[model samples]
Target: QVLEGLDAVRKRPGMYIGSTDGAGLHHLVWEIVDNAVDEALSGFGDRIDVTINKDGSLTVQDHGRGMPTGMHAMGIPTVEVIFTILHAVGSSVVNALSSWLEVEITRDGAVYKQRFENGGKPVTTLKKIGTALKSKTGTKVTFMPDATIFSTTDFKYNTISERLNESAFLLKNVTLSLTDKRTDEAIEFHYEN
Candidate 1:
C-alpha cells in the first residue's frame, strides 16, 4: 500500500520528491528556480542568479516583485506560509525538506528577512532588517539540505548550469547565471533576438 496526503512532505519526503538521493536533493533547487522563472515569464523580471555557496548552501536569487511579505489569511507572514505550508509545491517543499532556510526580500524601500529551521518552522519573525533603495526589488533564498535526509549534500555545478541555461530558452533577454564558490566556477546564459 501507499500513503499520501497533506503534511506528509516532511515525514514521507520520498513520496513527494521521489527519493533522498542526489536527484532528490537537487529537486529543491528546481522548485525555487521555477519561482524565478515564473517571474521572468510573466514579464516581471529578467534575471536569475544562482549560487552554490562556500558554506554548502544553495541560493536562488531573482530580480522581480518580491514574494509578498504581507500578512496571510492565517495570521502569519505570507512568506512564512509559503515555506511552511505542506500543500504548496512552491518554495514550501524546499523549506519543509531542508535543514534550514533563509529568505531576504528587497522591496518596499527596505530589506525584509526571515529564517526557518528544521523543516519549515519559523524561527524568526519577518521584519525589515536593513536598508534598500525604493527602486530595487527582488528576493533571495538560501537553504541547506539536512545531512541526515539526503544521500549527498554536495551540489554539482554542471547540473545546475545545464538546467538554468535551458530556462533561458523559455524567455528571451532573461539573464541566468550559475556560480560555484566552492570551486570558483561561473557560467551565464542569455538569449536575445
Candidate 2:
C-alpha cells in the first residue's frame, strides 16, 4: 500500500482496482501480474509463479518470451519503456514494468541477468552466467508494499481464496494455484465447467 508517486492517481486508484483499501492493494498486484499471465496464455510464456515473502514483499516470476531488448523507433529502450511507462497496455506496459524487474533470459546458450530495484530505479549492469542452465527465460518482479499506506502487512488466506477463486473460474483452461505458506495450505483451482 505504498503510495509512492501515486498521489496524483490516488482518487483514481479505483480505476485500477475498483476500490481504495486492502482490496485495491491486492488488485494492483493481480492486475500487474495478470498482464504477464495473458502473455503466457498467448504462448509467449509457460509458467507464472507468485510468492508472498515472509517479510511482506511480493514476488512474481514467469517463464516466457523475454522482453524486446532492441531500441524502439522512438529511441527508447524497449525494456525501459515496459518498466517506467504505465497505461501502455500489453507490450508497452509489460515492457515498461520489465525495467523495474529482476530478469534472466536464456537464449543462444547464454544466460543474461537483468536486475533492478523495486521502483523504476535503473542499474545498467548485466552479468553473464557461465553456461546457461535449463532454466527457461522469463521476468520476475518483487515489490515491498509500503506499510505506511496499508493497515496490515500480513495476508489473509481465506480472503485470498475468495479472490483467487474468481480468477480460477475465469482461467478455466489454465492452472491457477494459490498457496499460503504462512498456513502451509494451498488450493489449486481446476475446473472443467
Candidate 3:
C-alpha cells in the first residue's frame, strides 16, 4: 500500500517529521540542510548558506550538481519528484509541512525555478528563469513552515547553530553559513579537525 500525496504526511505527521513542537519545528530546517550536506559529502559542493527570512521563512542554498531538471521515468520533472512524491526522507518532508516552498536550480548555462504551496504540491512547473553568467550549478530551497500545524512558528537560533556546528565538525571541508536576516545576525562554520 502506498500513501500518496501530502495526505500521508497529514495523517501521520509525527511519523515523518517527529513532533509539532520546537524540536520538530527545527527538525524541518535540519532536514533541508542535511540535503545540502549530503551534496557536500558527495564532493559536489563545498558551500551552504542558510537564512532565516524576515517573513519567518527559511532558505537553504548549496553549490552542488543542481537537481535534475529533466523528466524522470515517472513522467514528472526530477526536481518535482524529489520535493513532492519522493519518499519519507529528504526535503520532501520539509515541503509537506511548509505553507509554501520555492526551489531554484542553476545548471549548465541556465537557471530554472519552481514554487510549491499547500505543502509539497507544486503551484507552478519548473520554468527557466534566465541564463547563468558563470556556469555555476547549485540549488536554492526556500520555505515557510505552516504555523497552523506547529505549536509555534518561531525558530531558535541557538538550536540551529548547534546542529550546524555539529554538521560542520562531521564534514570538515564544507563551510556552512546561517544568517538571520530579520535580526541582521550571521554565523559561519568550518572545521579542519
Candidate 4:
C-alpha cells in the first residue's frame, strides 16, 4: 500500500522529519528558513527573521518575491499546493506535520494571509488580509508542531543560532535574525565572504 500526504508523514515521521527528538523539532525551523534562503539566493530577498513566539510556535519571514497567488495546474490554489504537497517544495513538509500553520505574503501593496491545520488542511482560506503602506514582497510562515507527534515542542536557542549563523556565513549579504520572544532574547547575523 502506498502511503501519501500527511498520512505518510504521520506513519513514519522520522523518514520525513529525521526523528521525534529535539533535532527533528528544530529541523522544521531549518526547512522554513531554507526556503527564505533560496529566495535570497535568487537575489529576491535580503532579510530573514526567525522568531520563537510566546506560545511556542515558530515564525520565519523574508523580504522577497512572495509566492504566486494564482491557481496551480493541480486544480488547487497555488498556496495550498505549496503547503500541502511535498513535491511542490521541501518546506511544505513542515506544514504536513505541524499542528497548525499560518502563511502571509506581502506583495504589490497587499498582504495575503492563510491558516492551515491538520497537516496543510485549510483552517482559513487565503484572502487579502490588508493593504500595505509601502510596496513589499516576501513570505512569512508560522507553525506549531503537534505535541502528540513529537517528544517535545520546546525549541532550543543555541541549536537554531548555530545553524543560522552558519547559513549567514555561507550566504553573503543576507541577514538572519533569531528571536526568542519567551526569553526576550534576540541575535542577528550577517557575514561577508
Error of 3 at 15 (Å): 0.7
lDDT per prediction?
0.86, 0.54, 0.87, 0.86
| Tens digits of per-residue lDDT for model 4, 41-94 | 999988899999999999999999998876777556688877876552455778
- lDDT (C-alpha) at residue 175 in model 1: 97
Best by lDDT: 3
Better of 1 and 3 by TM-score: 3
How many clashes show up in model 3?
Answer: 0
Q: What ordering of candidates by lDDT runs from best to worst?
A: 3, 1, 4, 2
Stretches of model 2 off by over 4 angstroms after superposition: 1-20, 72-77, 88-118, 123-135
Residue-level lDDT of model 1, residues 79-187, one tens digit each, is 8777876653668788878889999999989899999888777889898999888888999999998887888999989988989888898778999999899989999
User: What TM value does model 1 have?
Assistant: 0.93
Candidate 4 residue pairs in clash (backbone atoms < 3 Å) = none
State residue 184's C-alpha deviation in candidate 4, in Å: 0.5
TM-scores for candidates 1 onward, in order: 0.93, 0.66, 0.94, 0.93
Model 3, 1-193: lDDT tens digits are: 4636776776677888789999889989998898999999999888899999999999999999998889987567888888877354667888889999999999989999989998778988899989986659999999999887899998888888889999999999889999998889899999975
Q: How far is candidate 4 from the true structure (C-alpha RMSD, Å)?
A: 2.1
Give the Å shift of residue 34 in candidate 3.
0.7
Give the Å shift of residue 129 in candidate 3.
0.7
